[PDB]
Structure formats: C-alpha cells, structure tokens
Design a binder for this molecule. Structure first.
Ligand SMILES: N#Cc1ccc(CNC(=O)N2CCOCC2)cc1
Length: 211
C-alpha cells in the first residue's frame, strides 16, 4: 500500500475495492489530508467523486466561498470544492467521468483531459477528449471560469457552474425542476426540460486505464 495516496486510484491500488470514504493526501503530503468518496466500481474504479445529485435534500444554490470550499455529505449529495479540484488536477493528467441515471436509463461521458485552474483563474475549466453515450455537453463549457450568484447565469438558473450563456450542463441546478434550464440538466442527453434524478462527476489519472 501507499502511505499517503494522492487520489482514489492510489487508494484502490492500495487494495481498497469497496466504494466509500477514504483519506487522500494532496501532493502526497501527510499534512494535506482530504476525506473523499471513492467510486471503486465504475469503469475500473479509482474515481474521486466530486459531485453527487440523487434526492434533492441538499441546497446547491450556494455562494462562491461554499463552491471554493465544498459542502454537503460525501455519502449523499455534496460538492467537493473547487480549491480541492484545482489541487487534485495539478498533481498530474486527470480524466473526468460523468455518470447519469434517470428513470432507469443510464449514460456517461468521459473526458481524457480534465483540469480546474486556481482561484486567480476563477477555477477555469479544461475538458478535452470526449467519449461516451451522454453526448458531449461539456465542450460548450470548455475554458470557462466558474460562476456563482455572488461572483448572471447562476442567479437566473439558481445554480452554479462553469457558465457560458448559459449552459448545456447544469448538474448543480435545482433538483426535480423540469422548467427550461432550471434543473439538473445534460442537454445532449435529456434536454433543458428534464431534470436528471442521479448525477455524479468524478476524476482519476487519465493513465489509470493502462497503469
Ligand atoms: N467531498 C466533499 C465535501 C467537501 C466539504 C464538505 C463540508 N465542508 C468542509 O469540509 N470544509 C472544509 C473543512 O472544514 C469544514 C469546511 C462536505 C463535502
């Protein structure tokens, strides 16, 4: 086992194959402990989950500081934090996976290159190298800064995201809201008038597929 695993891939290779809460260590630094939910079953496992929607119990209409820091219950609905995402994605080349499920139908998107810039970039999104079944709805968002109501798409749709004008992905939108562009949307899968029941966003090293 690795003593200070820097992500869920180094925690999984540590022989922990059950999905659930693990400690990772940013930059392998024992002073930078972070509790994360690891999805150890989806497409080979080793994924840090950084967003989960599943029941509408948690409020995602939250401010910049909340999106920077993270909020919620890792075992249920939560957001990991943009500062965490920046520090993880700085450690190497990461891949994004998005898992979606609605009324028994499932879809996914994988982006071979995924990174989140630091606060001086307003947590700029990079997403490249799409494959999957959900449709490439993140391409629209590539290179955009993060937006919250207090830093207007976030205000207009009462969510938070790497908004443009405004979205094809709104996974931090209002739960069960089928009104146009208000809900948990992935446009190239279920459009803007269908709020998705279950959504996860997760990341792991892009080289995990052959390590
Ligand atoms: N994944 C995740 C996730 C991230 C943060 C929270 C709650 N916020 C939080 O832990 N911060 C940082 C440490 O002290 C308390 C404030 C919940 C879920």
């Amino acid at each position: 086992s690795m003593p200070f695993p820097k992500d869920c891939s180094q925690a999984m290779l540590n022989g922990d194959t059950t999905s659930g809460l693990y400690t990772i260590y940013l930059n392998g630094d024992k002073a930078q402990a972070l509790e994360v939910f690891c999805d150890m079953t989806s497409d080979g496992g080793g994924w840090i989950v950084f967003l989960r929607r599943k029941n509408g119990r948690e409020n995602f209409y939250q401010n910049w500081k909340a999106y920077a820091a993270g909020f919620g219950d890792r075992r249920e609905e939560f957001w990991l934090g943009l500062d965490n995402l920046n520090k993880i994605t700085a450690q190497g080349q990461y891949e994004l996976r998005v898992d979606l499920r609605d009324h028994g139908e499932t879809a996914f998107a994988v982006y071979d290159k995924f990174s989140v810039g630091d606060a001086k970039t307003r947590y700029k999104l990079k997403v490249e190298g799409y494959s999957g079944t959900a449709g490439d709805s993140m391409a629209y968002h590539n290179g955009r800064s993060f937006s919250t109501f207090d830093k207007n798409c976030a205000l207009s749709y009462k969510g938070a995201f790497w908004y443009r004008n405004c979205h094809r992905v709104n996974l931090m939108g209002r739960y069960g809201d089928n009104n146009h562009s208000q809900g948990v949307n992935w446009f190239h899968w279920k459009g803007h008038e269908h709020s998705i029941q279950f959504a996860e966003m997760k990341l792991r090293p892009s080289n995990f597929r052959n390590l």
